Amino acid sequence: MGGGMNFGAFSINPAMMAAAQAALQSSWGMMGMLASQQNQSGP
User: Fold this and answer.
1) Where are the annotated coiled coils located?
2) Is the CB of residue 3 less than 8 Å from the CB of residue 11?
3) d(CA 13, CA 35)
4) CA pseudo-torsion sign 10, 19, 16, 2
């Protein structure tokens, strides 16, 4: 969005863009973190 697009939490705004992106994505992240720990763990 409007900024340097790197982390969203610094390189756009103070936390704001990473928080807005991750707030709902963390719910889908819960299944992704469990699957990628022992069922799809890569290098």
Assistant:
1) none
2) yes
3) 31
4) positive
18 within 8 A of 24, measured Cβ to Cβ: no
Structure-solving method:
NMR
Measuring CA to CA, which residue among 22, 24, 29 is closest to residue 7? Answer: 22
What is the token pair recorded at 20? 């807005």
The rounded distance, in Å, linking the Cα atoms of 17 and 33 is 21
- Measure CA 40 to chain center: 18
Q: Could you identify the residue written with the tokens 């763990």? A: 41
Q: How many residues does the chain have?
A: 43
